[PDB]
Amino acid sequence: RRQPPEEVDVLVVGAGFSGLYALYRLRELGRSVHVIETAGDVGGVWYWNRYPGARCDIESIEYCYSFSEEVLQEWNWTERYASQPEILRYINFVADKFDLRSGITFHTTVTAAAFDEATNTWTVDTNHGDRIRARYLIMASGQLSVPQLPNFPGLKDFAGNLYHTGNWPHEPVDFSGQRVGVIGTGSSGIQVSPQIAKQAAELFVFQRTPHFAVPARNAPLDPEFLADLKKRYAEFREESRNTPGGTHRYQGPKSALEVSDEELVETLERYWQEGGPDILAAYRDILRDRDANERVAEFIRNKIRNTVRDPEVAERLVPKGYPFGTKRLILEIDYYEMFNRDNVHLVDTLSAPIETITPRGVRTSEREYELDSLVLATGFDALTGALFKIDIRGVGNVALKEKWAAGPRTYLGLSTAGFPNLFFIAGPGSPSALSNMLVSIEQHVEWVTDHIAYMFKNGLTRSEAVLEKEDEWVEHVNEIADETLYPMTASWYTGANVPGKPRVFMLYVGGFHRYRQICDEVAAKGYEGFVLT
Numbered sequence: 001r002r003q004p005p006e007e008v009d010v011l012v013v014g015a016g017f018s019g020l021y022a023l024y025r026l027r028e029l030g031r032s033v034h035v036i037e038t039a040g041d042v043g044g045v046w047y048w049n050r051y052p053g054a055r056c057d058i059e060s061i062e063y064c065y066s067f068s069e070e071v072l073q074e075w076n077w078t079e080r081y082a083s084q085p086e087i088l089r090y091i092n093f094v095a096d097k098f099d100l101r102s103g104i105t106f107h108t109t110v111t112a113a114a115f116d117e118a119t120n121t122w123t124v125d126t127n128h129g130d131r132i133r134a135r136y137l138i139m140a141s142g143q144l145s146v147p148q149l150p151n152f153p154g155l156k157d158f159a160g161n162l163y164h165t166g167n168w169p170h171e172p173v174d175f176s177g178q179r180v181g182v183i184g185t186g187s188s189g190i191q192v193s194p195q196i197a198k199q200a201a202e203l204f205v206f207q208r209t210p211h212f213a214v215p216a217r218n219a220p221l222d223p224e225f226l227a228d229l230k231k232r233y234a235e236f237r238e239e240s241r242n243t244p245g246g247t248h249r250y251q252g253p254k255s256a257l258e259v260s261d262e263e264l265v266e267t268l269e270r271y272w273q274e275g276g277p278d279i280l281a282a283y284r285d286i287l288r289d290r291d292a293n294e295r296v297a298e299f300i301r302n303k304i305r306n307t308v309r310d311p312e313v314a315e316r317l318v319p320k321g322y323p324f325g326t327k328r329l330i331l332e333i334d335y336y337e338m339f340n341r342d343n344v345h346l347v348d349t350l351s352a353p354i355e356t357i358t359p360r361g362v363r364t365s366e367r368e369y370e371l372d373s374l375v376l377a378t379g380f381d382a383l384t385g386a387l388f389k390i391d392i393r394g395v396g397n398v399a400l401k402e403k404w405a406a407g408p409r410t411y412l413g414l415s416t417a418g419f420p421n422l423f424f425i426a427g428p429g430s431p432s433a434l435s436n437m438l439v440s441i442e443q444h445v446e447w448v449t450d451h452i453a454y455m456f457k458n459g460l461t462r463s464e465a466v467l468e469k470e471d472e473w474v475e476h477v478n479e480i481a482d483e484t485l486y487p488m489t490a491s492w493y494t495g496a497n498v499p500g501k502p503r504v505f506m507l508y509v510g511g512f513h514r515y516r517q518i519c520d521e522v523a524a525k526g527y528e529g530f531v532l533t
């Protein structure tokens with residue numbers, strides 16, 4: 001274990017994409033910097049989510065770092081969408097290439113942090129009894145990083161084996177000959193389920209609200225195409241940075257309302273055969289207008305009905321009650337096809353709610369299911385869950401957990417008034433998961449670490465967001481969300497999946513590009529909306 005230093009210019013919490021880049025860039029900027037991370041090695045989500053089928057939904061060529069020309073030229077992606085093992089190899093490659101581990105303490109969880117107004121510094125404690133004095137504190141602790149259990153009793157009475165996809169065993173788990181249940185059909189359950197169906201004697205899929213999924217159509221990556229792309233890589237990334245969604249997705253200029261049914265069908269059919277998430281921007285108003293949205297959703301529901309032979313089973317898979325795209329769009333690989341197998345069962349817990357877990361399985365309001373193993377694909381305590389596990393204290397002993405009890409309050413998502421010198425990477429109040437996260441994450445890490453270099457350059461030692469600019473930012477974030485269909489639906493974006501958590505859409509929806517312009521204008525004017533001393 002790397003004993004962490006007693007004093008540092010910048011402390012970083014988290015060694016996933018965000019944390020490693022912050023460590024890297026801070027080093028280049030001549031600052032002392034060190035990382036604390038709970039896990040035994042680097043990766044973040046790609047270290048933790050080792051469940052079979054784990055795979056990215058953003059193209060390998062887009063979902064990657066661009067800060068290093070060498071890494072761009074040297075690394076060879078192999079598939080349209082990178083599997084978890086492949087991305088963890090990439091992360092390991094990058095960590096090795098810049099000697100990053102020497103600046104990280106592993107197996108160590110930060111527990112508390114308190115700002116000292118006398119010294120303009122943070123003092124940060126860990127579960128190993130370490131205390132670290134840092135002038136700046138960068139929370140790179142994730143968006144989807146605290147596993148959430150589902151809300152029913154009897155979990156600790158189950159006699160069989162119990163798993164969560166976000167805390168998956170390090171060695172392959174063997175489901176051979178078993179009766180297996182999976183609870184949850186978001187992207188984790190959609191990915192892990194077809195893999196388990198290949199080992200288990202019987203698989204029970206416990207669905208509540210159906211999520212919309214479209215075919216991935218993964219494929220080998222052409223090494224022609226790659227070597228070619230490599231010739232203009234820095235240029236291609238810059239094209240992805242100047243978009244709402246951080247990828248080469250085509251921005252459809254028309255309205256899903258202006259077009260005829262025939263042109264609607266033909267256009268959606270070509271996104272469907274191509275595969276991938278780009279259908280989300282097929283028409284400009286899919287996320288803005290309920291009647292627009294509904295023509296798309298209805299096309300997708302019919303595609304779903306047509307994938308499964310038994311029509312009672314197919315109708316059970318059709319998403320109902322919320323607009324298309326307002327929960328995260330999922331990419332599926334042999335998920336729908338799966339339900340055509342003899343040994344796979346769709347359990348509709350909308351009609352038959354789960355009452356309790358029992359020693360032998362799952363009780364709904366209609367019957368009991370006997371199981372040997374149970375897999376929880378029940379998601380995460382998103383965006384705030386990880387910060388809330390740490391006792392973070394601002395000016396006048398204000399707890400972050402209390403100040404944000406009605407939902408997260410930030411200027412630009414980057415900082416919160418009352419908490420000087422503290423930064424969140426790609427979290428609430430910013431574009432975050434509504435963009436290619438590597439483009440969200442690089443922008444934030446660049447902006448924060450520039451900011452810090454600006455502070456040190458100019459002999460300043462305290463950076464704090466102006467409370468009024470915060471409040472105006474929060475209202476702004478809420479106002480632009482309320483022009484979309486996003487706040488209409490219960491998802492983890494809204495916090496609706498953690499019992500008692502306030503239901504407020506937590507993300508900036510105006511697009512990465514515009515958000516980035518705003519941050520650039522701010523930093524240009526000497527960090528307008530911050531007070532520096």
Ligand SMILES: Cc1cc2nc3c(=O)[nH]c(=O)nc-3n(C[C@H](O)[C@H](O)[C@H](O)COP(=O)(O)OP(=O)(O)OC[C@H]3O[C@@H](n4cnc5c(N)ncnc54)[C@H](O)[C@@H]3O)c2cc1C
Pocket residue numbers: 013014015016017018019036037038039043044045046049054055056057058063108109110111140141142143144145386389390425426433435436437438441
């Ligand atoms: C399974 C999965 C697949 C994903 N696929 C996509 C994809 O399709 N497209 C996309 O753009 N992004 C996707 N993401 C979202 C993902 O959050 C981002 O892509 C990116 O990986 C986040 O990187 P990060 O470093 O900011 O956070 P993380 O990868 O979550 O890393 C945070 C790290 O901090 C650690 N940590 C938290 N609290 C503490 C503490 N108190 N003390 C010490 N350490 C702590 C955690 O152990 C974790 O290792 C996916 C998320 C998941 C869960």
Ligand SMILES: NC(=O)c1ccc[n+]([C@@H]2O[C@H](COP(=O)([O-])OP(=O)(O)OC[C@H]3O[C@@H](n4cnc5c(N)ncnc54)[C@H](OP(=O)(O)O)[C@@H]3O)[C@@H](O)[C@H]2O)c1
Pocket residue numbers: 055056057058144149150151152183184185186187188189191206207208209210328349354377378379380433492497
């Ligand atoms: N390739 C990828 O892109 C990929 C893969 C995995 C994860 N991720 C990222 O992580 C986010 C979370 O993915 P996720 O699938 O882990 O979590 P999720 O999207 O939060 O879905 C959790 C699932 O479990 C269900 N659930 C929760 N509580 C339940 C209960 N008490 N009873 C029955 N069912 C219950 C939810 O049902 P309801 O919807 O009815 O609440 C939903 O089906 C994704 O949206 C994406 O951002 C990405």
